[PDB]
Design a protein around this ligand. Structure first.
Ligand SMILES: Cc1c([C@@H](C)C(=O)O)ccc2c1[nH]c1ccc(Cl)cc12
Ligand SMILES: Cc1c([C@@H](C)C(=O)O)ccc2c1[nH]c1ccc(Cl)cc12
Lengths: 304, 304
């Protein structure tokens, strides 16, 4: 029993973190096989970040200007290329610790673990969700750029995020491992504001199922609802509309607990309308939306 | 910017997890040098757990009855001994991945990372605090016993916890790495109830400092208090009494933000008396107490 905001074990990812320096800028890189991936803004000064012409700035850079250090040993850069907002530095040595891996572009509402790094050294690991406005609420200080987000399926690491920017509002923006930003964000120090940070409804319902499994049942009521009726309330509360696809994904949790998905929606509806009244669910005073239905199943079954 | 419930990178600890089986019971062990540490209740069936005589049950066990598997390779057990509530299995091979390490017995209010494991395989990592009633609120299912809690100081892992029990209330109990339980708990399936789970006041104040540093300042008021006056309110709200030692530990956070420790106590006092009024602090609707002042400094400075 017990339910925690849990990250994946980070060992496989720690073995990939390197330090990348270009001029006076130092950030993190991800070393997989003989390639080091890092934000292309490593070539920028804070002045350049106001209006960077990346192709032009890159003309002045050669392989020897990209200093890559893995632990305390320097890697030899034998090639470099820019793919969207990431630089790929080809090195002469394949990372001996390269895990089985994939590059995946996640959807909003999906969760992942971030290994926050500074100067190629891991400092901590925490769990995130890609928000419906394509920002993440992370913990990133100067030097953390190039830290990556990931999920693990047994022994295969699926890298889904690379940290690039902190918006003036304190939220974070970044790219998948092909260098395409999530959402409308760009790697430029400019006024970039996020849209509405709606709540990931399917995740909140999955977390209400985790709560029932772990003994917190006070919020269960005698009501039911329909998707349309539920969605009128979700709209009013800035919650994502619930679809039949979400109902289907919650199927296994519904089966395990015997609580129909629409009955859990009705409990959620009353919680939205009435609040918590000073009570908590799984030690939280708000409805948690950063556990997917897969995360709840995984944690409630002990997948390794 | 941004402040998250962050765990230490778990790689160094993942390299130490092994599977230990005795008869029909399988749990986790911690392999450091040529020793594997695991809960002594590995020798018990669920029937034995009602009233186990560990010395007597251990007489029927030989080195060859303890099956230790590291990954998919079996380790040879050449000695075994019981130290308090842990078994130490001497193996013929030193763990090649043994990090620099210490065994420390923590105080209530101290935080640590747990690497939840099943069958010697890491499933996830999360941050905990040793509660003032010596329980932890973890996420542990059957098979998770032997999972460990730890902190890291650069390259040295200080192991402070080993998971042994889940109380009927769903909270968790365990030992330090010398096998002494935290608090009054025993490794017996019996009625064991926890005392008052008070709030770790110094941690909540450290987290209010993290909130000010990260821009959440609405709760700051025009008041101050004294330790005695603050403690009258802390007592009423089941908060730990604040001491001059706690005020001293918050010194660096006070200096960095320019908010006197007693002024932050007065903000905390008003939050206790008035509630949050539907507002949040660092995305939480309750006062978080599982960040120590050291954790706040570390996360707000990017220590690796
Ligand atoms: C894989 C790769 C890279 C990486 C960065 C990549 O583009 O994936 C960069 C540069 C080169 C490269 N293969 C080469 C073969 C011939 C020559 Cl002349 C250059 C390169
Ligand atoms: C370190 C150690 C252990 C571990 C479990 C320990 O007690 O720390 C267990 C058993 C033995 C041991 N050294 C030995 C030397 C001679 C003999 Cl006859 C037995 C043992």
């Amino acid at each position: 029993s017990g339910f925690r905001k849990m990250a994946f074990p980070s060992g496989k990812v720690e073995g990939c973190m390197v330090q990348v320096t270009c001029g006076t800028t130092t950030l993190n890189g991800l070393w997989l096989d003989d390639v080091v991936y890092c934000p292309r803004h490593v070539i920028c000064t804070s002045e350049d970040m106001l209006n960077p012409n990346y192709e032009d700035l890159l003309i002045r850079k050669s392989n020897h200007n990209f200093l890559v250090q893995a632990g305390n040993v320097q890697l030899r850069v034998i090639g470099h290329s820019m793919q969207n907002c990431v630089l790929k530095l080809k090195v002469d040595t394949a990372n001996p610790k390269t895990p089985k891996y994939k590059f995946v572009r996640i959807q909003p509402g999906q969760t992942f673990s971030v290994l926050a790094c500074y100067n190629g050294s891991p400092s901590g690991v925490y769990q995130c969700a890609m928000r419906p406005n394509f920002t993440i609420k992370g913990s990133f200080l100067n030097g953390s750029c190039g830290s990556v987000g990931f999920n693990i399926d047994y022994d295969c690491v699926s890298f889904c995020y690379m940290h690039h920017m902190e918006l003036p509002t304190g939220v974070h923006a970044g790219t998948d491992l092909e260098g395409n930003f999530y959402g409308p964000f760009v790697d430029r120090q400019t006024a970039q504001a996020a849209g509405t940070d709606t709540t990931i409804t399917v995740n909140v319902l999955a977390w209400l199922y985790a709560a029932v499994i772990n003994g917190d049942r006070w919020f269960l009521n005698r009501f039911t609802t329909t998707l349309n009726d539920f969605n009128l309330v979700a709209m009013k509360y800035n919650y994502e509309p619930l679809t039949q696809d979400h109902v289907d994904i919650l199927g296994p949790l519904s089966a395990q607990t015997g609580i129909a998905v629409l009955d859990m929606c009705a409990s959620l509806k009353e919680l939205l309308q009435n609040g918590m009244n000073g009570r908590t669910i799984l030690g939280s005073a708000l409805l948690e939306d950063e556990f997917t239905p897969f995360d709840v199943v995984r944690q409630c079954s002990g997948v390794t």
